[PDB]
Design an enzyme around this catalytic site. Structure first.
Site, short mmCIF file in Angstrom:
data_model
loop_
_atom_site.label_atom_id
_atom_site.label_comp_id
_atom_site.label_asym_id
_atom_site.label_seq_id
_atom_site.Cartn_x
_atom_site.Cartn_y
_atom_site.Cartn_z
N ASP A 1 44.96 47.99 37.25
CA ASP A 1 44.37 47.88 38.42
C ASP A 1 44.04 46.43 39.13
O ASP A 1 43.27 45.62 38.63
CB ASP A 1 42.66 48.36 38.44
CG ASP A 1 41.94 48.82 39.57
OD1 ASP A 1 42.43 48.05 40.67
OD2 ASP A 1 40.74 49.26 39.69
N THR A 2 45.09 46.18 39.96
CA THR A 2 45.01 44.82 40.72
C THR A 2 43.94 44.42 41.45
O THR A 2 43.73 43.36 41.84
CB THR A 2 46.35 44.61 41.34
OG1 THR A 2 46.37 45.43 42.54
CG2 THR A 2 47.62 44.73 40.48
N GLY A 3 43.19 45.52 42.10
CA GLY A 3 41.88 45.35 42.76
C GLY A 3 40.62 45.14 42.08
O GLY A 3 39.63 44.91 42.51
#
Ligand SMILES: CC(C)CN(C[C@@H](O)[C@H](Cc1ccccc1)NC(=O)O[C@H]1CO[C@H]2OCC[C@H]21)S(=O)(=O)c1ccc(N)cc1
EC number: 3.4.23.16
Lengths: 99, 99
Positions: free
Chosen positions: B25-27
């Site tokens: 999850d890059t967010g």
């Protein structure tokens, strides 16, 4: 561009003649923006995240330009604390994770 | 591995001898798991997302193995609806976004 993740992966997006910043977000199924007025019809919808749910407006077939690459698709408008570009758009700009 | 985003980027994680699935999850700034009991001391903390905030236990210097690559860092334990591998761990396994 290949981008590392030491900082938030924020990109500039052009949507409806407006310039916004949004997070490239592999954990988000859908694209959600807060600080934006999109014209026309839309359907009510709720989405859930870490702290529970928010109500959003769902707009279909919206053009967005993300780091200068075009995509058309659903944009949810509502009280997200950060603009997020989700997988529905990320796939259209050919975005991949690599390790 | 290079990973496209037509499906959720779920990977297997081994943590404290337990096997879990988590979203790359890059967010997410931080790594947050729900279905896990880690031993030892921890500090209280709150994190916010879409929907607002949740209280989490902050565990420091935790070993995780994600697709068989090791990382050591902070793991937040609390009522997230989905296990999330955040940027604090993603940087350690050499994960990047590409488009
Ligand atoms: C809103 C983001 C900037 C931050 N979120 C990470 C994000 O990837 C979450 C991660 C996530 C994933 C599943 C469930 C809850 C949270 N995704 C998310 O809320 O996506 C929503 C929009 O698209 C939909 O797809 C899934 C839920 C909807 S977050 O989960 O709230 C979060 C916030 C703070 C930390 N430290 C770690 C994670």
């Amino acid at each position: 561009p290949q981008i590392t993740l030491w900082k938030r992966p924020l990109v500039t997006v052009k949507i409806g003649g407006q310039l916004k910043e949004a997070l490239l977000d592999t954990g988000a199924d859908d694209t959600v923006l807060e600080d934006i007025n999109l014209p026309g019809k839309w359907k009510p919808k709720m989405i859930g995240g870490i702290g529970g749910f928010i109500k959003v407006r769902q707009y279909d077939q919206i053009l967005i330009e993300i780091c200068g690459k075009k995509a058309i698709g659903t944009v949810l408008v509502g009280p997200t604390p950060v603009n997020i570009i989700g997988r529905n758009m990320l796939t259209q700009i050919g975005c991949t994770l690599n390790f």
